[model samples]
Target: RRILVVEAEAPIREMVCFVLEQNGFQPVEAEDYDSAVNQLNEPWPDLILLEWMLPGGSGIQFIKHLKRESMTRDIPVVMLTARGEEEDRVRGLETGADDYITKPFSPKELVARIKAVMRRI
Candidate 1:
């Protein structure tokens, strides 16, 4: 399945892309908000793995854009953030994410979380 990866950090981005590929997922890479939003064109991804902190625009802005659009609103979104506070987690979910994953997560955990989210769709 296709997954959009909206992460700015090069090493983390590369690691996620590699992990997704290893699990048979085609990852659409985006280093920033504009690039990530640009990929929203056609062949919309089955899921979006968005980093809460990003350049150009924050992930919150991206999520608002995503949930506001008719075509993109249904796409499952899973947030990745270094902030694991209860407030932030609730905010992410309230903003329309299907799930949330804290940073420093293991590759296996990430894959498992993705699988769990996809299963609901």
Candidate 2:
């Protein structure tokens, strides 16, 4: 499946994409919220791996925009947050993220969690 990786850190984004590719999943990269929105075009991504703190807009704002859009609303979103706080996760969830992965996660863990979310939708 095509997964949009909306993240700011280049190394992380590159690594994630590499892992996704190795796992037989396609990854599309966006450096921030603006680019992410731009990438939300035809043949839409199967899912989005969103960064919690993004440039141009917050993850919450992006989610709101995504959920309100007719073309992208049904696509599943998984937040990537570096924080360990429950409040952050709760907010992501409340803002409509289907699931989340904390930073420093192993490639295996990331793929597993994403696969779990994909299975549901």
Candidate 3:
């Protein structure tokens, strides 16, 4: 599957890419909002793994934009972030994310969550 991962931190981005690659996904990395949008426009991904806080805008904004566009609305998005607080999780789900993964997550758990979300849709 093609997966778009938007994360500003290089180490985190690398880790995510590595894990996803190991899990049999063709992972693409985008460090900022613009790059993410550009990548999305070039070729839609099967799933999007977005960081909650980005340099240009919040992941919530990205989600909102995607949801507003008919062509991108149905694509599954999984919000990955360090903000594991109840409110943050609620807001992410409220914004139309298919799933949310808190930071420091295990590769196994992340893959499982991705599978679960994909199955749900």
Candidate 4:
């Protein structure tokens, strides 16, 4: 399935993309918001793993844009952030993310969470 990963850090982005490839997923990389917006024009993604801090804007902003449009509203979103605060988690969920995963996350754990969130859809 197609999974869009919107992350800014190069090594982390590349690592996750590589791991996702190994797991039988066709992962697309978007380092910034515009690239992510561009990807939206393609076939819709099965899941979105979005960083809390994007280059052009926060993931909260992007997800809000996503949830506003019917075309993108049903797509599952998982917020990936370094901030593990309860407030941040609650805020992300309130903003429409299907799940939340904190940074320094294990790669396998990340994949597992992604799979779980996909199943929730």
Candidate 5:
């Protein structure tokens, strides 16, 4: 499956990419919302690993926007957040995210979350 990872942090992005690659998934990295939007035409992604925040916009808004559009609405999206606050988690879920991943998570944890989300929807 192709997972479009919209993480701005270089280390985390590269780390996830490596983990996904080693785990038999193709990982596409996008540092910001615009770049991510540009990658939408590449091909239909099996899932999206979206950072909770981005350089130019909030990830929640992006999710809402994508969920509104017919073309991208069905793609499953998993949110990656540094904040462990309950409200953030609720908001993400309420908005449209399939799952949430708190930052500093281990590679195994990341892959596990992705697998869970993928299997669900």
Candidate 6:
């Protein structure tokens, strides 16, 4: 299935892409909010793997936009971020993320979380 990965850092983006690819996902990467939105509108994705922070706008804002749009609201989003604080996790979930994973995360765990979220979706 297709997955869109929105991350500002190139290394992290590459790593996530590699992990998702290894797990059988066709991943499309976006470095910023505008590109992410543009990609979302172009072809759509089965799932979205988003970073909590972006260059111009926060990922929270992106999620807000996605949820507000009827066409995109139902798409599953799994947030991958370095903000490990409990409150941050709560905030992400409260913002309409389908699932969340903190950074320094194992590739296996990330893939597992993705699978779990996909199954639920």
Best by lDDT: 2
Q: Native-vs-model 4 lDDT?
A: 0.83
Cα RMSD to native, each candidate? 2.1, 1.9, 2.0, 2.1, 2.1, 2.1
Residue 95 CA error for candidate 2 (Å)?
1.9
lDDT of 6 at 99: 86
Give all TM-scores, in the order shown. 0.87, 0.90, 0.88, 0.87, 0.87, 0.87
lDDT tens readout by residue for model 2, 1-121: 9999988999999999999999999999999888898888886899999888878887777888877878888888988888679537556468778888888789988988898988988
- Ranked by lDDT, the better of candidates 4 and 6 is 4
* Tens digits of per-residue lDDT for model 6, 1-121: 8899888899998998999888889998999888888887757888898877667787678888888878888889888777579538556457678888888789988889889988987
Error of 5 at 108 (Å): 2.0
lDDT of 3 by residue, 1-121 (tens): 8899888899998999899899898999899999998886756888898887766886668888888878888889988777568437556467667888888889998899889888886
Off by over 4 Å in 5: 86-93
**lDDT (10s digit) by residue, model 1, range 7-111:** 889899889999999889999788988888889978888899988776788666787888787888878888888757843765745666788888888998899
Q: What is the number of backbone collisions in each predicted candidate, taken in the order shown?
A: 0, 0, 0, 0, 0, 0
Q: Each candidate: what lDDT?
A: 0.84, 0.86, 0.83, 0.83, 0.83, 0.82
* Model 1: how far residue 120 lies from native, Å: 0.8
* Cα lDDT over the full model 1: 0.84
lDDT of 3 at 72: 88
User: Which one is best on TM-score?
Assistant: 2
Report the lDDT tens digits of candidate 5 across residue range 42-110.
Answer: 586778888876687877788887777678888889888886784375564676788888887888888
Better of 2 and 4 by lDDT: 2
- Candidate 1 vs candidate 2, TM-score winner: 2
| TM-score, predicted candidate 4 vs. hidden true structure | 0.87
